[PDB]
Amino acid sequence: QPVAAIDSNFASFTYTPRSLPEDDTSMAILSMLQDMNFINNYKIDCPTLARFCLMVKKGYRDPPYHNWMHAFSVSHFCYLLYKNLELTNYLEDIEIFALFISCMCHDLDHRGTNNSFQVASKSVLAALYSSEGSVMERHHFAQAIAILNTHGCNIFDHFSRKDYQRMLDLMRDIILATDLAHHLRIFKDLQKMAEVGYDRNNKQHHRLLLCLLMTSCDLSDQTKGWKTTRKIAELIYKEFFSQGDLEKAMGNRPMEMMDREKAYIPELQISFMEHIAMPIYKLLQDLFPKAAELYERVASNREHWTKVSHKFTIRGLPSNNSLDF
């Protein structure tokens, strides 16, 4: 089923994938994989790919932000980077395939809480993963492996030994890179690559670009219009404040951004965009000139947040004409 039949704007950076109905996202996944040629290129079995994608979608829970629609929109951005940035000029085909597959699986079985929360609550996930770090990301990867090994879901089962091993190592590294702590950890290396210039002969640069691109996809809701950033802030903060409510109950001090009594959304949001999102799309711009508009949308969305911040102070009366609050 052609990509062009979904919407004429599907491969544009202007397109908002969350506007696609959730019942159509699975075929949109197949259409993107076909449009990138990975089906014919790696001789993926069609019914297996079909069963795989349904398993991935079924593997997501329903918290406000970390759900299938997020995994879906992250994958679509990966497709957008393929179609708009000519990724084949920088990475091998298997690496692009791996990135896209990893985008689908990257938040599997997310519970709407961060890594710190898993450890503090002494969950099973923490017992299993806290000593290696990146608790939730190790779980996501493990859920992805458990899916691959379900009957009729292994899309790599015909791959050669070398290609099978490459896909698995790539998926692990890429899903692990989705811990923002990892991104911050490697930020200096990403800058160094961007300054010396990308070297496609350098396997180290391949890994680093894969990390940045993955991160760029995870944060891609910031690169659309105002409506998307506003809506996504609503979902993220609802999730944060729900975590903070659990922590307060445990007799723990939540961080400021998870404390609904104390959190000031405009400052948190502007800080997130100034100090995390923008420098990421700034690095992408340095490496890929065609990514310029991404960085420009983010900065523009940033200005919109500042221009709107004054609405968080109550001027005049509330609408009921009452001071009962």
Count of beta carbons in the 10 Å neighbourhood of residue 263: 17
Contact status: 286 vs Zn ion (CB under 5 A):
no
Does residue 66 have an active-site annotation? Answer: yes
Residues at the site binding Mg ion, with contacts judged by CB under 5 A: 107, 178
Specify whether the CB–CB gap between 210 and 173 falls below 8 A.
Answer: yes
Binding map of Zn ion across residues 75-114, x = CB under 5 A, - = no contact:
--------------------------------x-------
193 vs 232, which CB is nearer to a copy of itself? 232
Residue 76 labeled ligand binder: no
Amino acid (one-letter) located at 166:
R
107 assigned binding-site residue: yes
Is 158 marked within a binding site?
no
Q: What is the 3-state secondary structure (H, E, C) of 130-193?
A: CCCCCHHHHHHHHHHHHHHCCCCCCCCCCCCHHHHHHHHHHHHHHHHCCCHHHHHHHHHHHHHH
Residue 62's identity, in one-letter code, is: D
Residue 64 CB, shortest distance to a copy of itself, in Å, is 9
- Active-site residue, from 66, 110, 183, 205: 66
In sequence order, which residues have a C-beta less than 8 Å from that of residue 310 and are 6 or more positions away?
none
* Of residues 67 and 178, the one with the C-beta less far from Mg ion: 178
Q: What track of x and - describes contact with Zn ion for positions 218 through 237 (by CB under 5 A)? A: x-------------------
Three-state DSSP class for 274? helix
Question: What is the spatial distance between Cα 23 and Cα 107, in angstroms, rounded to a whole number?
Answer: 19
157 is in an annotated binding site: no
- What is the set of active-site residues? 66
* Annotated binding-site positions for Zn(2+): 70, 106-107, 218
Applying CB under 5 A, the residues found at the interface with Zn ion are 107, 218
* Annotated binding-site positions: 70, 106-107, 218
